[PDB]
């Protein structure tokens, strides 16, 4: 997270850390959606241009974390992966369209003051909240800048959703309906954006009617980090809720 600030304890109880068993390494961010499922981006688990293509055994899921490095005994829970589900229409070849993947835990996780699931969005939630101008929150342990560095604590940043026109002609990359971009405009003043290490993390919004948080998106891609005239792109969660319910109800 660039231009972010330290997260308060329990500010993002659904924040998940995707960890590489060997060699030890922080791969991506993710979200706890139930005591059994974790949502994350597809390029985190599979992306051959970097020859990234993990299998359960390779990864571990660390929940309830605050500190980036330290193993927080009795607070964070570590879970093994039963199965990895990557969207069949996921397209990395061109622009990472339909960038999403679910992960079932071998054993259900117990919730706590530090471990709580976020809500997925429904039609009412999307139509209502995914509006340009409306702000969302992004969290992560990713780098603090394009180059250098790394945070010692989970980083948080709030970002405004940008109209599709501005996004589309803000890049030479093809922007699909499964994507949405967010960030501050060059002149607005304020800054911020996710960055390496934040991918797969959540972009949540808080409903004004029920006080509940909904994950509207997943950090997908961006050209650099916190560049002007540029924006971060997020997987449009709802637009793909069909696939989610599919694999959750079926598996």
């Amino acid at each position: 997270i660039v231009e972010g600030s330290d997260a308060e304890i329990g500010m993002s109880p659904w924040q998940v850390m995707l960890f590489r068993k060997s060699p030890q390494e922080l791969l991506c961010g993710a979200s706890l959606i139930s005591d059994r499922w974790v949502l994350t981006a597809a390029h985190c688990l599979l992306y051959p241009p970097w020859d990234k293509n993990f299998t359960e055994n390779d990864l571990l899921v660390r929940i309830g974390k605050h500190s980036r490095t330290r193993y927080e005994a009795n607070i964070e829970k570590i879970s093994m992966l039963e199965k990895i589900y990557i969207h069949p229409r996921y397209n990395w070849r061109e622009n990472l369209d339909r960038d999403i993947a679910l992960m079932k835990l071998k054993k259900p996780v117990a919730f706590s003051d530090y471990i709580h699931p976020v809500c997925l969005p429904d039609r009412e939630t999307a139509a209502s909240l995914l509006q340009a101008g409306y702000k969302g929150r992004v969290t992560g342990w990713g780098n603090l800048k394009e180059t250098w560095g790394q945070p010692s604590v989970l980083q948080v940043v709030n970002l405004p959703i940008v109209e599709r026109p501005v996004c589309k002609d803000s890049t030479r990359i093809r922007i699909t309906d499964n994507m949405f971009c967010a960030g501050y405009k060059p002149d607005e003043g304020k800054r911020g954006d996710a960055c390496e290490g934040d991918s797969g993390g959540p972009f949540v919004m808080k409903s004004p009617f029920n006080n509940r948080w909904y994950q509207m998106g997943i950090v997908s891609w961006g050209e650099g980090c916190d560049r002007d005239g540029k924006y971060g792109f997020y997987t449009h969660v709802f637009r793909l809720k069909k696939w989610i319910q599919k694999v959750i109800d079926q598996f």
């Binding site: 600030s5 308060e8 304890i9 329990g10 500010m11 109880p13 959606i33 139930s34 919730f111 706590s112 003051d113 530090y114 709580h116 699931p117 976020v118 809500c119 997925l120 101008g133 409306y134 702000k135 969302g136 929150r137 948080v156 709030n158 405004p160 919004m205 808080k206 409903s207 004004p208 029920n210 006080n211 509940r212 948080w213 909904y214």
Partner: peptide, 27 residues
């Protein structure tokens, strides 16, 4: 079911440092 409600925040009627910025972006 009980999703999106933070034990240390909503559950205790306490707001975090910046959630208010979010609620205001709706105006």
């Amino acid at each position: 079911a009980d999703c999106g409600l933070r034990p240390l925040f909503e559950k205790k009627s306490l707001e975090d440092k910046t959630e208010r910025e979010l609620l205001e972006s709706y105006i």
